[PDB]
Design a protein around this ligand. Structure first.
Ligand SMILES: COc1ccc(C2=NN(C3CCN(c4nc(N)nc5sccc45)CC3)C(=O)[C@@H]3CC=CC[C@H]23)cc1OC
Ligand SMILES: [Mg+2]
Ligand SMILES: [Zn+2]
Length: 333
C-alpha cells in the first residue's frame, strides 16, 4: 500500500466540525456530509475526533499520525456505492461509541476491547461492492469460488478481514503496533471474529450465543467478552432504525437503491432475483422498514437490552417510535 502523503493527512485535519457533537445519539452524519464540499474529508475527521476523544489510541501507544493514516488507508478501500461506502463505517464507528459511552457498555469490556471495537468499525466492510454474499455464490465469481474452496460461506467478511490484516501489516498504519504479546494477539483475533460475525446468515446463532452467555453466571469470562464485542459491532451494523426518523429514512433510501442495483445486475446475468431487490415491483419503503423492524431489529435490540445491556434502552424506544411513524405513513396513504 502506498503511503499517505501529508497533504492527504493535512486535508483531513483542517475540517473543523463546528455545530456538531459526535458523541451524541442524535448526531446526524447526513448533515455533516452536506455541510461542506469535501464530505469524505469530514467523515474521516469525525472518526479521528471520535478515536482521540475516547482517550484510547494514547493508552495503547498509537500516535495521532498512525491513527490518521489508518483511517485514510481504510477510506481508499471504500467504493462509491449507495450504502456500503465509507460513511456507513464511520456511522458504525460513531454509533458504537454511543453504545459504549452513552449506553454504558464500556463497563462490560476492557479498554483495549473498546479500542478494538472502534477500529474494527472502520474495517468491517472494506472493499464492499454493493453486492451481497449471495451474488458471488450464484454467479460463481472468483471470490465466491475462493471462499467456497477455502471452506467459508461468509464471502465478503473473509475478504474484509484479509484487507484489514493487509492494512495493519504496514507499520505507518498499524494502530495496534504499540501492543505486545497477548494484547496484540487479542486485538487481531477479536477484530477478525467481530467482522466474521457481521454475516447476517449467522445472525440467529450469534444472537442465541450471546444471550445464552449473558444468562449464565458461570460463562467463560473471555468468551463473554468476545461475544459482547461481536454483538456490539452487530448492533452498530443494524443501528439505522435506532436513529431519529429522518436519519433512519435516509439510510433506508440508500440501502434500497443499493439492493436495486444488484437486482439490475442479477437480471443481466440471468440469475435469480428476489423481490426485495426488484426495482420493478416498487414495494414501499415503509413496509420494508416495518418488516426489518419486526423480524430483525426490534427483537435483537429488545433481547440484548433485557439480557444485560440495560443502558441501551433508548434503541428499543426509538425503534418503537420509528415503527409507529412508518405505520402513520401507511395509515394516511
Ligand atoms: C436501513 O434499512 C436497512 C439497513 C440495512 C439492511 C441490511 N440488510 N441485510 C439483510 C438482513 C436480513 N434481511 C431480512 N431478514 C429478515 N428476517 N426479515 C427481513 S424484512 C427485510 C429484510 C429482512 C434481508 C437484508 C444485510 O445483510 C445488510 C448487510 C449487513 C447488515 C445489515 C444490512 C437492511 C435494511 O432494511 C431492509
Ligand atoms: Mg458487512
Ligand atoms: Zn456494515
Amino acid at each position: 500500500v502506498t503511503a499517505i502523503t501529508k497533504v492527504e493527512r493535512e486535508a483531513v485535519l483542517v475540517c473543523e466540525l463546528p455545530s456538531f457533537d459526535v458523541t451524541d445519539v442524535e448526531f446526524d452524519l447526513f448533515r455533516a456530509r452536506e455541510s461542506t464540499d469535501k464530505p469524505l474529508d469530514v467523515a474521516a475527521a469525525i472518526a479521528y475526533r471520535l478515536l482521540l476523544g475516547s482517550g484510547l489510541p494514547q493508552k495503547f501507544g498509537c500516535s495521532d499520525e498512525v491513527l490518521l493514516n489508518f483511517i485514510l488507508q481504510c477510506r481508499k478501500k471504500y467504493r462509491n456505492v449507495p450504502y456500503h461506502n465509507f460513511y456507513h463505517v464511520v456511522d458504525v464507528c460513531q454509533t458504537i461509541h454511543t453504545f459504549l459511552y452513552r449506553g454504558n457498555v464500556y463497563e462490560k469490556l476492557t479498554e483495549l476491547e473498546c479500542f478494538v471495537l472502534l477500529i474494527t468499525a472502520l474495517v468491517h466492510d472494506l472493499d464492499h461492492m454493493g453486492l451481497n454474499n449471495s451474488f458471488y455464490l450464484k454467479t460463481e465469481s472468483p471470490l465466491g469460488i475462493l471462499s467456497s474452496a477455502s471452506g467459508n460461506t461468509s464471502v465478503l467478511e473473509v475478504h474484509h478481514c484479509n484487507l484489514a490484516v493487509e492494512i495493519l501489516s504496514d507499520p505507518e498504519s498499524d494502530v495496534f503496533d504499540g501492543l505486545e504479546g497477548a494484547e496484540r494477539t487479542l486485538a487481531f483475533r477479536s477484530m477478525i471474529d467481530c467482522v466474521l460475525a457481521t454475516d447476517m446468515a449467522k445472525h440467529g446463532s450469534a444472537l442465541e450465543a450471546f444471550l445464552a452467555s449473558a444468562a449464565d453466571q458461570s460463562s467463560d469470562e473471555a468468551a463473554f467478552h468476545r461475544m459482547t464485542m461481536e454483538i456490539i459491532l452487530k448492533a452498530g451494523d443494524i443501528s439505522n432504525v435506532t436513529k431519529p426518523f429522518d436519519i433512519s429514512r435516509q439510510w433506508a433510501m440508500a440501502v434500497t437503491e443499493e439492493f436495486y442495483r444488484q437486482g439490475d445486475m442479477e437480471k443481466e446475468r440471468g440469475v435469480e432475483v428476489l423481490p426485495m431487490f426488484d426495482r420493478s415491483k416498487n414495494m414501499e419503503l415503509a413496509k420494508g422498514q416495518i418488516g426489518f423492524i419486526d423480524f430483525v431489529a426490534a427483537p435483537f435490540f429488545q433481547k440484548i437490552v433485557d439480557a444485560c445491556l440495560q443502558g441501551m434502552q433508548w434503541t428499543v424506544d426509538r425503534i418503537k417510535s420509528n415503527r409507529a411513524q412508518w405505520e402513520r405513513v401507511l395509515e394516511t396513504r
